[model samples]
Target: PKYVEGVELTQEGMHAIFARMGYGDITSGSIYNGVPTIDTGALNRQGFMPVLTGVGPHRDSGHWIMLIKGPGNQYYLFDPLGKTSGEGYQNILAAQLPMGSTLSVIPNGSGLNMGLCGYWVASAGLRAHQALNQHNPPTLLNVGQTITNEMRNELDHDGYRKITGWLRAVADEFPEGDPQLDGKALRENTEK
Candidate 1:
């Protein structure tokens, strides 16, 4: 079968990439059953979250990589995770956003992607503020060690702090978000 030539799963590589990109342990579901998993042409584009996550390593089939971000419908490539999201869903960090590092979230039109993965760039502002206040996420910081003084003077300066504060103000007007946490976090944070 043609799929045999490239049907190995790269769970390990997938793990590292997701972790760095801030994605947690996305369950090992079918990557994508067939095709390239990208029904649309061009692999990268604006608001293309579903496509990005379903390609290659998450594709369920192929060389564990999206050979090329393509375009067009009824094409050879198909998205196994197409329009499927919600609780227990997972996402991959395909491409990084510009300076703010935004995500490309495309709706599957189906409820499958409901709780999968959806985040924004402005939150970096919050992180920046936390760092200035010496409260950065331990994940982003060196555990058991403090954030570097150089980083504090350079990156953790007031300029970034101001932006972060501004971002907080903007977000405050908005409602609470559903940035789903992992099992431990969810269980403990939600404990009664």
Candidate 2:
């Protein structure tokens, strides 16, 4: 999967993409005063889960990543951007995400889209979900190792189509206004 430049996605937009991918049942809720905390048991039960987390200093910047339950009670982390360093990345590590976890940077399309991380996340998750549901599910060794060459190629091709379809769908659905849905609006906002 690749990132789309100049496209920002809201929580609603992410959910819309998930719905289009046939995984609309997955939902996310805000963490109020840390009231809602991670339930590793539930996560393990769910197996493959995508998370949208706040990265960066002020927790203002956000990124979408995936966590897959692995052998020995470990969760495999897959960042769409393949982030290595930064305060947010460090913080995520410090948190020990869902108890015990390991990081494995996976290959993805290039281009930095501050707001399009969700699309990559959704695309990657969709591909993995489909693969896992196959009659003969492939063994997931690590984040990068799980996706075979054929799967990677399909992800790249289908991921692009999905993102393009999403952009047009948003534009057609929201004729009134949504800067992120309009290419001209996105360019204008970024050019300044």
Candidate 3:
């Protein structure tokens, strides 16, 4: 949506952002198909966390959430839009997440727009990469703060233009962007 406003971020664009962020190996784990095709145990062992798809039945069915392992040897849900405990959240868990584990919920309320799912996922993956690499790992609330703080862009109304700009540049580079498009790219691209 960088080149085209109001359009959903492409899979090409999403993966490109992941690559820019140095998370080239993050697999597409299916967590919304009413059963997880992703191996939660392997993900835990391998330290590969899931950026869950927080889709509701219809209109509510569009958001990206992060599946985080908390301190209690249990899983936690990190929703970027802050709809933490709802029918949507529960249905998603029942349909996609592993059973028997009580999940902690952290609804990081960015209040991001529905069409911003791609942006949310990219941001979540960025934080996940940070956490995995031990770089002052952010809590769910911290994630909200970072993106919201970064949302002030003169050229891009609603911040989507700027975010998409970053997404597009890398999709140009890797055609599947990378993680290195951090503060510098994010900030610099707003000019011209």
Candidate 4:
């Protein structure tokens, strides 16, 4: 499929891209999925809470990571690069958001990806949230984690090669022919 291959993903770009990629890009205001209650100040920001946790590693750059509130009200790690199961999850440095706190969130990764992380977290959160809304659900975090793993397996494992190839084809259109550098340059140009 034709995807805008790049290293970093932007909030708006992701919301639109996921649909094209055949993945559900849940937002705080999706009709079928309902609002995850998270919003983006720049992209409509509709809902009870902001989509981004407002915490990050570099404010913008690097890879993508995510934070999901589990059924027990504890926060679990949601890194795309993180292992699907076992000790891998443990290595992700899981933490918890304060009880009854809507926007309360602590970042997981060091300073690696500011822009990409927010997009991934909210997308995963929306998936988990939608699953919970379904009937006969397991533990909130359990389902969330399951769906996340499923997505990671498909996108990272099965679909990665296709995306990388597309990136190679489009890299020239992007500054320096490197998705990572291109993303950085794109952000710098847009921000400046």
lDDT of 1 by residue, 93-124 (tens): 22222233332221212222112121111121
Q: Considering TM-score, which of the candidate structures 3 and 4 is the better prediction for this target? A: 3
Question: Clash number for every model?
Answer: 21, 0, 13, 5
* lDDT score of residue 190 within candidate 3: 36
Error of 2 at 11 (Å): 1.6
Error of 3 at 72 (Å): 4.8
Model 2, C-alpha of 118: deviation from truth (Å):
0.8
Each prediction's Cα lDDT score? Answer: 0.25, 0.46, 0.48, 0.36
* Superposition-based RMSD of candidate 3 using all C-alpha atoms, in angstroms: 5.5
* Per-residue lDDT over 7-101 for candidate 2, one digit per residue giving the tens place of the 0 to 100 score: 54455665554444444355542222323234455455656555656633455336666555555444444455543412234344326455455
lDDT of 2: 0.46
Q: What is candidate 1's CA lDDT for residue 14?
A: 34
**Best-to-worst TM-score order:** 3, 2, 4, 1
The regions of model 3 sitting more than 4 angstroms off are 1-7, 31-33, 45-62, 85-87, 94-100, 128-158, 171-192
Q: Give the TM-score of each candidate.
A: 0.18, 0.52, 0.58, 0.38
Lowest-lDDT window of 10 residues in candidate 1? 113-122
* Candidate 2 TM-score, true structure as reference: 0.52
Model 3, residue 37: C-alpha shift (Å): 2.8
Specify the highest-lDDT model's number. Answer: 3
Give the per-residue lDDT of model 3 (tens digit) for 1-192. 332234444445544445555655555454444544456665565344444464334532334555555444456554545544323565556444455656555444444544555565455534443453454556656654554444333224646666555545544443323335343343344331
lDDT (C-alpha) at residue 182 in model 3: 42
Cα RMSD (angstroms) for every candidate in the order listed: 18.5, 9.2, 5.5, 12.1
The residue pairs in collision within model 2 are: none
